[PDB]
Design a protein around this ligand. Structure first.
Ligand SMILES: NCCCC(=O)N[C@H]1Cc2ccccc2[C@H]1Cc1ccc2c(c1C(=O)O)OC[C@H](CCC(=O)O)O2
Ligand SMILES: NCCCC(=O)N[C@H]1Cc2ccccc2[C@H]1Cc1ccc2c(c1C(=O)O)OC[C@H](CCC(=O)O)O2
Lengths: 149, 149
């Protein structure tokens, strides 16, 4: 459970935003990419797994599940690749709502950043620091620390 | 102390590797960039600070310390910018040894990755997971968790 992440791909300004969500905490990392290819997803997962202990990833769609480059990255990083089928249906809505929320933050920072990629990183910052009272950043650290001990 | 990071810029294959080191743990994040400009450094710091609680950054050189874009990023993210002058002289050697180490890992993975950027991320992974017995990844989580509670 502390090692479970969910991939989520959303769109804005004819551009692609790739998000990884730490399921137990709501903590995220995100990137703007030209298009959602196997290669982009594979590279994104390698980066994520070098930064946090990623044990299982619920992939966002079947093309990434199938991709040989994604499978190579998951093998390299010791990640168990699983589907992202919301057997628990409330998953779809939670993801959808987060995409709403992130797009809203992006809109709020648009006067400050010239480029979408910058606004996305500002949105990651705001999301992970937001007190909901604990923040996502605080929850992921405690969950993983408790897991180690 | 749990919030202190050190910037470190090193070179390989006529390309630039930008590293941020969590001083108390040895945990790192890194990126390949075309050149070390204010803009690249500013963007790198924004990303880092959305992902971990960055309170103070010891900048790697005077150009980044001075850069108005770096200052804007640090202001935005709530980061105290400080010099990286090794008042403790043993800092230079510790950084230098890590750069050795990272370049060595990059060489060991060079058959597996077509592109330097991929090899750098593999090196980040290996460094943060390496048991020294605790790993850098384990130390940063415990340090920050202890700081919160
Ligand atoms: N050519 C056959 C290679 C065999 C093959 O599949 N290798 C695996 C091995 C391996 C091991 C770990 C992670 C990925 C990979 C794959 C490598 C790879 C994937 C995505 C990339 C890559 C490269 C690269 O090879 O460095 O380059 C950077 C690029 C940046 C984002 C973009 O631009 O998409 O994403
Ligand atoms: N519109 C007013 C001027 C904007 C301006 O400079 N303000 C500050 C405000 C602010 C607030 C937080 C972080 C950075 C910044 C600066 C923004 C910025 C910096 C680096 C960048 C940027 C942009 C951007 O502007 O989005 O673009 C992406 C690029 C990353 C790609 C790469 O180079 O790796 O690096």
């Amino acid at each position: 459970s502390p090692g479970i992440w969910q991939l989520d791909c959303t769109h804005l300004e004819g551009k692609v935003i790739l998000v990884a969500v730490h399921v137990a905490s709501g903590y995220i990392e995100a990137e703007v990419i030209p298009a959602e290819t196997g290669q982009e997803t594979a590279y994104f997962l390698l980066k994520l797994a070098g930064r946090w202990p990623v044990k299982t990833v619920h992939t966002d769609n079947g093309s990434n599940f199938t991709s040989t480059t994604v499978k190579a990255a998951c093998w390299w990083a010791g990640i168990k690749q699983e589907d992202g089928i919301p057997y628990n249906p409330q998953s779809q809505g939670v993801i959808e709502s987060m995409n709403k929320e992130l797009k809203k933050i992006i809109g709020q920072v648009r006067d400050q950043a010239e480029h979408l990629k910058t606004a996305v990183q500002m949105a990651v910052f705001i999301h992970n620091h937001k007190r909901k009272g604990y923040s996502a950043g605080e929850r992921i650290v405690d969950i993983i620390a408790t897991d180690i001990q």
